[PDB]
Design a protein around this nucleic acid. Sequence first.
DNA 1: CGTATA
DNA 2: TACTACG
Lengths: 254, 255
Amino acid sequence: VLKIISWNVNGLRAVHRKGFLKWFMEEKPDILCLQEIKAAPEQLPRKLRHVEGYRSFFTPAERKGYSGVAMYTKVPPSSLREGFGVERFDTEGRIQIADFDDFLLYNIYFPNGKMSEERLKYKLEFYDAFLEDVNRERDSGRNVIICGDFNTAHREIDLARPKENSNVSGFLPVERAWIDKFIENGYVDTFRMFNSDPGQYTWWSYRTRARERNVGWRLDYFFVNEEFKGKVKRSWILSDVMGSDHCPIGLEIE
Amino acid sequence: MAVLKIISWNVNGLRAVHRKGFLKWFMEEKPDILCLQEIKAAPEQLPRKLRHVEGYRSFFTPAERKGYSGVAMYTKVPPSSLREGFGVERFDTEGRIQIADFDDFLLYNIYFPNGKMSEERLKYKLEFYDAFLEDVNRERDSGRNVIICGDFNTAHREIDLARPKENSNVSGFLPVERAWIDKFIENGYVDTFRMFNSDPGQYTWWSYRTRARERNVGWRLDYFFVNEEFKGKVKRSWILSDVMGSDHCPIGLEI
DNA sequence: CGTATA
DNA sequence: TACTACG
Ligand SMILES: [Mg+2]
Ligand SMILES: [Mg+2]
């Protein structure tokens, strides 16, 4: 009975100032996966660096205050790989692959593609590198859990304004195709196993005050390989917890 | 020799001053050379109206880090060459150094490091200071005359800032920093402004936070220096306090 | 306070 | 509309 939470936290120091630890005390996950920590460990308060009952792993970006992922775990992994083995994709703080034996756990902050053509390219090439990597591991016999911010809504149901954004990165046809392909390689969007409703979102723009209007996108997913699909008992969106432009998502196993 | 006008200005974002009518001011004041620091942009990010100004050749030396540091020079008359570093990698990749050969003189356009945020940055500042001295001395020793302008990030004497006592432990008026200026001057260089003006309350930078500029609670961080052999040629050295757009104001030199 | 990637 | 960096 393992509870895993994924959250693009939009600055760890920022959520801390909004009572992140309190929420983390209340919700007792067995694993906590975070994206966009936007900090080097040394910049973090001591109460955040170490938390009672957990082992903490930080993977910052080389660039200061950019990107970065973190994992808190009640039970240590056998190992923790911080890259795919390709330099350009490995130095932005985007990748945590934690071996818990039963399963590898992928904590990923996938690149946003909105600001440039060259970044959109970076995103898709990251996507590619990711697939090779996760396939290599599942093909070798391992069960995989993949959480994090994918930066893409898959289907029209997955965002409030699908037509206006058909030319916006995050709902480009090229991007949605990749998710299609991803799923075809034997992986399941665990949330879609339990919920087929519309209006289920994980990110809302700050600019519009869109969150109260509920004008969002689903950018955050839990994926498993299908062989492991048996073990997933719950997969939900904690859309009530504030502090970031994303909300956290949840997965329960065994 | 005769009738040459040079302006130095820490512009605090070239795109920023542009939006406040920088070009208009640049039309009005007609300098023969314009030296800028903290452009905070790569040339490609700059409006075409700025990369190409009528009657001037423009040189941009951005930092590797995007939107950080950076210097620029506009000149009516091209230099023979333009060196963009001291030949030491760490000091060369931040956008801090333009050394332009105008034959008569080399012209140093420098954005010296701010030392306030960390011990390690304060250290970077003093080591920059050192590298700079060696460089300017080699050139002066070789016979070359030199004009050095820019944001030194340090007031020299007690008269150089409004509040000297409270800031004696603040980087920008640390004893170690003022000592270096002392040493700098001792190597045969002159603070051209001090040649013509010994009044207090002459400042070039004012903090944004306090709205200090209307209270005139400033520091003098921007200087024109020459080697003493060339001192003969400097006819004027002033502070253009009139000009807004940045937390620094521009300074002027006439030779 | 102010300039500059999600 | 915000978080971050660095001034
Ligand atoms: Mg975000
Ligand atoms: Mg400044």
